C-alpha cells in the first residue's frame, strides 16, 4: 500500500490589481511629562540684632 495521495504548492498570486495590500505603516507619537518638585530647604539662623 504505497502511493502519493496529496501535495502542496508554493503557488502565489501576482497582485498586479492590488488584491492584497499587506501590512500598513502609520505615524505614531507618544508623550511623556516630567514635572519638577520643590525640595526641603536648609536654613542658617543668626541673631537679629
Amino acid at each position: 500500500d504505497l502511493a502519493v495521495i496529496g501535495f502542496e504548492l508554493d503557488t502565489r498570486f501576482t497582485n498586479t490589481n492590488r488584491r492584497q495590500r499587506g501590512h500598513l505603516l502609520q505615524t505614531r507619537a507618544l508623550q511623556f511629562r516630567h514635572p519638577i518638585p520643590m525640595h526641603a530647604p536648609v536654613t542658617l539662623p543668626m541673631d537679629t540684632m
Binding site: N15, R18, R21, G22
Partner: protein, 49 residues
C-alpha cells in the same frame, strides 16, 4: 466598496538562492558560566574532604 483611501505600496520582487551544499555549524553557549565563575580553584575546593 464604501470608502476611498490613497494606498502607496512597495511591491518587492527578489529571490535568495543557495549554490554550494557545504556548511559547518556550531551552537555556542555557556559564556557566563565560564567567565563569571571559578573554573580551576573551585574544583580544588570541591576535592576538600
Amino acid at each position: 466598496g464604501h470608502q476611498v483611501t490613497r494606498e502607496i505600496a512597495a511591491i518587492p520582487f527578489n529571490l535568495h538562492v543557495n549554490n554550494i551544499p557545504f556548511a559547518l555549524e556550531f551552537k555556542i553557549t555557556g559564556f557566563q558560566k565560564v567567565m563569571g565563575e571559578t573554573q580551576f580553584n573551585g574544583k580544588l575546593a570541591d576535592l576538600k574532604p
